[PDB]
Design a protein around this ligand. Structure first.
Ligand SMILES: *[C@@H]1O[C@H](CO)[C@@H](O[C@@H]2O[C@H](CO)[C@@H](O)[C@H](O)[C@H]2NC(C)=O)[C@H](O)[C@H]1NC(C)=O
Ligand SMILES: *[C@@H]1O[C@H](CO)[C@@H](O)[C@H](O)[C@H]1NC(C)=O
Ligand SMILES: *[C@@H]1O[C@H](CO)[C@@H](O)[C@H](O)[C@H]1NC(C)=O
Ligand SMILES: *[C@@H]1O[C@H](CO)[C@@H](O)[C@H](O)[C@H]1NC(C)=O
Ligand SMILES: *[C@@H]1O[C@H](CO)[C@@H](O)[C@H](O)[C@H]1NC(C)=O
Ligand SMILES: *[C@@H]1O[C@H](CO)[C@@H](O)[C@H](O)[C@H]1NC(C)=O
Ligand SMILES: *[C@@H]1O[C@H](CO)[C@@H](O)[C@H](O)[C@H]1NC(C)=O
Ligand SMILES: *[C@@H]1O[C@H](CO)[C@@H](O)[C@H](O)[C@H]1NC(C)=O
Ligand SMILES: *[C@@H]1O[C@H](CO)[C@@H](O)[C@H](O)[C@H]1NC(C)=O
Ligand SMILES: *[C@@H]1O[C@H](CO)[C@@H](O)[C@H](O)[C@H]1NC(C)=O
Ligand SMILES: *[C@@H]1O[C@H](CO)[C@@H](O)[C@H](O)[C@H]1NC(C)=O
Lengths: 533, 49, 49, 48, 49, 49, 48
């Protein structure tokens, strides 16, 4: 079961400054008595933070109890300030539904509890606690937890209720990051005596947890208590929390002899901060100094690809009824299409997908001036030979890749097609030749071969047919089974894009520093109109 | 050392100390030939002293 | 070799010859902010710098 | 003296067109085309 | 997926962004079985990792 | 001459160290030794430095 | 002054005997023995 709420005001979103607030240890490396300048997701100094509240009015006629779904960026700075231990925990997740796993972190009445499950969350996830002396009553957090793949519980402790009125006495600060499947939690605690906002001040947050959760965290919201003296008419009181977003920025950190951070400069904050970071030092002598740009970093990205929508015919190219024999491999142009390889994932799994001069997962966001696909079948044992600098009966006499090859070699097993016995098309390879082929050279000649440089008029001694059949019976072992191969050869010239990856494309942004990607040519800079022809 | 620290390094990343994992005693590591050494010779082909 | 009050330049006459006789590679520091975003022929080693 | 110092800066910009044994002289071209696992090998050749 | 993330969701997948209730056109079960019959070729055999 | 073998046997592995397989056809060697044995197809990965 | 300039040239020619982390100090010995796909990695170490 769950509690319910009504007369609930929307969040007001009043904003405050993270005045030097919320520094944390960027990595696990122990450093002592050094200055470290580093790029990471940090909360910038004097960044905005959005406040959320829990307050009854003079009466329940109207109430704030802010538990919206809050987006999670590259990370979150979170600060709770409170007196009566109102903010108990968080739910981190994607959908925050039983349709996907969520992490619940609870500073529960006596234990920290971390659980990852498909949760049926309550509509307003909360604790219920009996106000005067009750350390607990009920937990309207979730109805069900169907597939719990992680759990952690911390050792027993006690919480004071601290129900007295007035100024907030506690400030609890957190940073959340989700990297390589770990949720990192950093935290710190500060005594405070304040009525509104975050107090100004430097904070360093120590690492509390690495949680091997593996969740897709994109949203979170807080779990808070509501209070009652009579286990009825629960009400909200006495807390606010502030959320700020980490942004990729350069900080310079000062490490003590004990390796604690004790000062930091946000290099983007002031000209004096850029100076301090430039001279790698917190104190600077009188002078004029050249200063390295930490002022401006790109945030927007402009991605602009030709508006050709037709998908490439890889289904047609790959699922042909029969392929060429490797001695007679066929070359085809691929053009005016989007090379989405993911269309194949439902149909064919590739035993080989090796790319040269291009990485196979940048391949999804390049564009190419031309693409050629060479198609043939070989033994699975021979797919080794389809690479630059290989040697053997295929590389020597059937199909040679150039040393300067750029492209991808793709192969998959097709014993279910090319090794069927059902009237099957035969596959051949050239076994004998007087010399090695040149790269992308072909030799479809079928004149009888003699080791001697002589005509045959076969049958004769020292005369042989140059082409061997492959033994693609269904009985043969996988080395002898057929593999289809296509070799895609690319070129990335200063010429119009002919094939492109599936990237969506965005409006131009001009006179601002941005990341950009034009036809896969990607960098950062300012875009303007130009006089160029 | 800090209670969980296993080794220490100077500003050159020379590992100058290590925690013995059995004793938890901290050992200093010195380089195998600390400091300068220099040999006075008259010429070879006048003395080998 | 002294300055001449009848001239805008406060150089001497000889000094005006010397300052004309050496030719600066950029004709001066003021390759100003707007000036490198020029035509295709307006590409310039100073803008590349 | 003017010519020597002008020339030295001109050779210094032109040195940015060297490959130094990277697949490209152009940094954006490496970062466009290769993944960090193997871009960083090429970027280190340009940096050094 | 991002590195070391997991997705055990089993909602019906539409290529369209819009949801479906199956059986329906343009939506599918997201998960497929491996055909680990004892007959299948070595590429199709199960490997533990 | 390895081409003598191309009609008899296809090699699942032909991996060379300090010599490239193509230049192999026009080197000469001060000496060669051949070490012969049978292993699992699964074990062939282990015959490398 | 004579001795210093002699010794500077003698050390320069002897520095051609260094491998610089290539498989060989001898350029012909790389080109003899490795394909262009992978000789170039060795040649670049000698060049640099
Ligand atoms: C291209 O065609 C020529 C002519 O057929 C081939 O030349 C033959 O090469 C072998 C070995 O080098 C000789 O034994 C033949 O006598 C040559 N033929 C003639 C007519 O001279 C050549 O090998 C083919 N391939 C390439 C890559 O050039
Ligand atoms: C709430 O919102 C109103 C605007 O609708 C604003 O004027 C007011 O100051 C806010 N008060 C609080 C306590 O957030
Ligand atoms: C949010 O940040 C910008 C610049 O950091 C600032 O101008 C703005 O005033 C902030 N928000 C509020 C409500 O002040
Ligand atoms: C998730 O919860 C809702 C609410 O009752 C329910 O209708 C739905 O069936 C649940 N998910 C699944 C997979 O059953
Ligand atoms: C939460 O706190 C209650 C009250 O002390 C305790 O009984 C319970 O064990 C805690 N949670 C879990 C999962 O144990
Ligand atoms: C999740 O739990 C249900 C039982 O409630 C089970 O049927 C389902 O297979 C589980 N899913 C996974 C991925 O374990
Ligand atoms: C380092 O920590 C110890 C124990 O907390 C303390 O005695 C010492 O003074 C600290 N040193 C510095 C420089 O903070
Ligand atoms: C190849 O295409 C035909 C018709 O489009 C289809 O019937 C067949 O199932 C396809 N084969 C594969 C392996 O996808
Ligand atoms: C994916 O393959 C399955 C068969 O395994 C088929 O039923 C389904 O229609 C295919 N869908 C697409 C989009 O290719
Ligand atoms: C084992 O390790 C412990 C603690 O690290 C230490 O006290 C002990 O002397 C070591 N050796 C033996 C034989 O116990
Ligand atoms: C090549 O092998 C075939 C059998 O596949 C055999 O008939 C032929 O005589 C052999 N020729 C040579 C020159 O080895």
């Amino acid at each position: 079961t769950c509690g319910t709420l009504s007369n609930k005001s929307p969040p007001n979103m009043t904003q405050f400054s993270s005045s030097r607030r919320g520094v944390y240890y960027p990595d696990d490396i122990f450093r002592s008595d050094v200055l470290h300048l580093t790029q990471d997701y940090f909360l910038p100094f004097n960044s905005n933070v959005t406040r959320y509240l829990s307050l009854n009015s003079d009466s329940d006629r109207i109430v704030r109890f802010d538990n919206p779904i809050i987006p999670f960026g590259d990370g979150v700075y979170f600060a709770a300030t409170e007196k009566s231990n109102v903010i108990r925990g968080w739910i981190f997740g994607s959908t925050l539904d039983n349709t996907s796993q969520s992490a619940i972190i609870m500073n529960n009445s006596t234990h920290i509890v971390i659980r990852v499950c498909n949760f049926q969350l309550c509509d307003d996830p909360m604790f219920a606690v009996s106000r005067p002396t009750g350390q607990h009553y009920k937990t309207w957090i979730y109805t069900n937890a169907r597939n719990c793949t992680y759990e952690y519980v911390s050792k027993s402790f006690q919480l004071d209720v601290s129900e007295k009125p007035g100024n907030f006495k506690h400030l609890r600060e957190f940073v959340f990051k989700n990297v390589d499947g770990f949720l990192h939690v950093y935290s710190g605690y500060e005594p405070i005596d304040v009525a509104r906002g975050l107090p100004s001040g430097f904070s360093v947050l120590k690492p509390i947890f690495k949680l091997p959760l593996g969740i897709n965290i994109t949203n979170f919201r807080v779990i808070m208590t509501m209070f009652s003296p009579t286990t009825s008419n629960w009400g909200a009181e006495a807390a606010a929390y502030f959320v700020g977003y980490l942004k990729p920025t350069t900080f310079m950190l000062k490490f003590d002899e004990n390796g604690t951070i004790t000062d930091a400069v946000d290099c983007s904050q002031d000209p004096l901060s850029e100076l301090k970071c430039t001279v790698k030092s917190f104190n600077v002598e009188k002078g004029i100094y050249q200063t390295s740009n930490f002022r401006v970093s790109p945030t927007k990205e402009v991605v602009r690809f030709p508006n050709i929508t037709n998908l490439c015919p890889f289904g047609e190219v790959f699922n042909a009824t029969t392929f060429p024999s490797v001695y007679a491999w066929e070359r085809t142009r691929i053009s005016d299409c989007v090379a989405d390889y993911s269309v194949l994932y439902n149909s064919t799994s590739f035993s080989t997908f090796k790319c040269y001069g291009v990485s196979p997962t940048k391949l999804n966001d390049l564009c190419f001036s031309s693409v050629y696909a060479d198609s043939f079948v070989v033994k699975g044992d021979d797919v080794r030979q389809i690479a630059p600098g290989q040697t053997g009966v295929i590389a020597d006499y059937n199909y040679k890749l150039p040393d300067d090859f750029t492209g991808c070699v793709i192969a998959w097993n097709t014993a279910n097609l090319d090794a069927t016995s059902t009237g099957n098309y035969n596959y051949y390879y050239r076994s004998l030749r007087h010399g090695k082929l040149k790269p992308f050279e072909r030799d479809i000649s079928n004149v009888p071969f003699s080791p001697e440089g002589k005509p045959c008029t076969p049958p004769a001694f020292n005369c042989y047919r140059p082409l061997n059949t492959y033994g693609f019976n269904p009985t043969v072992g996988i080395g002898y089974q057929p593999y289809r191969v296509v070799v895609l050869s690319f070129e990335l010239l200063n010429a119009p894009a002919t094939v492109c990856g599936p990237k969506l494309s965005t409006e131009l942004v001009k006179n601002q520093c941005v990341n950009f990607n034009f036809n896969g040519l990607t960098g950062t800079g300012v875009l303007t109109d130009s006089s160029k022809r | 050392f800090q209670p969980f620290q296993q080794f220490g390094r100077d500003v050159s990343d020379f590992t100058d100390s290590v925690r013995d994992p059995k004793t938890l005693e901290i050992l200093d590591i010195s380089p195998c030939s600390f400091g300068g050494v220099s040999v006075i010779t008259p010429g070879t082909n006048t003395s080998s002293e | 070799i002294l300055p001449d009050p009848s001239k805008p330049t406060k150089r001497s006459f000889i000094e005006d010859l010397l300052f004309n006789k050496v030719t600066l590679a950029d004709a001066g520091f003021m390759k100003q902010y707007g000036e490198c975003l020029g035509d295709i022929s307006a590409r310039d080693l100073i803008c590349a710098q | 003296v003017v010519n020597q110092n002008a020339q030295a800066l001109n050779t210094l910009v032109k040195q940015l067109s060297s490959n130094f044994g990277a697949i490209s002289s152009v940094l954006n071209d490496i970062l466009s085309r290769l993944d960090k696992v193997e871009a960083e090998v090429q970027i280190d050749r340009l940096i050094t």
